[PDB]
Scaffold this active site. Sequence first.
Site, mmCIF file in Angstrom:
data_model
loop_
_atom_site.group_PDB
_atom_site.id
_atom_site.type_symbol
_atom_site.label_atom_id
_atom_site.label_comp_id
_atom_site.label_asym_id
_atom_site.label_seq_id
_atom_site.Cartn_x
_atom_site.Cartn_y
_atom_site.Cartn_z
ATOM 1 N N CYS A 38 0.857 -1.191 0.000
ATOM 2 C CA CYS A 38 0.000 0.000 0.000
ATOM 3 C C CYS A 38 0.881 1.224 0.000
ATOM 4 C CB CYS A 38 -0.959 -0.004 1.194
ATOM 5 S SG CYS A 38 -1.815 1.600 1.444
ATOM 6 N N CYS A 41 -0.407 4.278 2.180
ATOM 7 C CA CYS A 41 -0.163 3.993 3.601
ATOM 8 C C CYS A 41 1.221 4.467 4.012
ATOM 9 C CB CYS A 41 -0.320 2.511 3.901
ATOM 10 S SG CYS A 41 -1.937 1.821 3.512
#
Length: 116
Positions: A38, A41
Amino acid sequence: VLEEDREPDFIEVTSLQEFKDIMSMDILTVACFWADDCGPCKLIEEPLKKIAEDFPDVVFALVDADKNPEIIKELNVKSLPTWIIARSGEYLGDVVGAKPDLLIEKIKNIKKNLEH
């Protein structure tokens, strides 16, 4: 053991049970959903530590989406990162995407409405 695996200010949630237990408490709780694969993230990693510092009265819990798909499914989380805000078992708002400044705003907004 390899301890304090994430920052000490973050609690890490490993079951839907633990999750529901924590959002039940009489305390503003911000759960951050994250994962390894991700990109957004990663780049909110630092600003989130700054926010947890700015709001010591709020609990910040981390949920690894890889390892908690049933919480991911229970809460209809379809994108990362996602913050879900709650207090005493009541869900008070959310932020979808790498949007730290909206989390801040939403946090202050929910606090003002709790002090009415």
